[PDB]
């Protein structure tokens, strides 16, 4: 099942100080962090990027497998959003321009509204 304190953040590559990837289904990967801990791992999303369609569905399935309960990102389309809701994952949007560390910190500080629908 999804664990609320496992926060996935779309990422352009590994590391807490890299920027959040504005894209979801075709992100390079996800930095997944335990809010307490803070232990982190990098989950590669290369498989989703090779697909002609259904990348956000595949990415949502990658996240459900990691047990993530929150996803922080820039943009997410309709089918990806539905797949995330289906998996029980809360979505934070519009986080491009932040580092991964900063997005998790803004989320924890209550500064990230959970999204009600896709924004693209």
CATH number, domain containing residue 52: 3.30.420.130
| CA 29-32-34 angle, 5° bins | 175
56, 25 contact by CB (below 8 A): yes
Name 94's Cβ contacts closer than 8 Å, sequence gap at least 6.
74, 119
Distance CA 1, CA 100 (A): 24
CA distance 20 to 100: 5
- In terms of residue numbers, what domain contains 82? 1-120
H-helix or E-strand spanning residue 11: strand 3-11
Contacts 24+ apart (CB under 8 A), 79-85: 79/54, 80/24, 80/25, 80/55, 80/56, 80/118, 81/56, 81/115, 81/117, 81/118, 83/56, 83/57, 84/60
Q: Is 115 helix (H, G, I), strand (E, B) or coil?
A: coil
How many domains is the chain partitioned into structurally?
1
Give φ, ψ of 49 to 5 degrees. Answer: -60, -25
């Amino acid at each position: 099942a999804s664990h609320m304190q496992r926060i996935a953040v779309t990422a352009e590559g590994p590391g807490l100080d890299g920027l959040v990837d504005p894209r979801f289904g075709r992100a390079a990967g996800f930095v997944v962090v335990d809010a307490a801990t803070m232990a982190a791992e990098y989950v590669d999303n290369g498989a989703s990027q090779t697909l002609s369609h259904g990348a956000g569905i595949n990415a949502a399935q990658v996240l459900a497998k990691s047990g993530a309960g929150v996803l922080l990102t820039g943009y997410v389309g309709p089918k990806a959003f539905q797949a995330l809701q289906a998996a029980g994952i809360k979505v934070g949007q519009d986080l491009e321009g932040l580092t991964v560390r900063q997005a998790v910190q803004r989320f924890l500080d209550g500064q990230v509204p959970m999204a009600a629908g896709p924004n693209k």
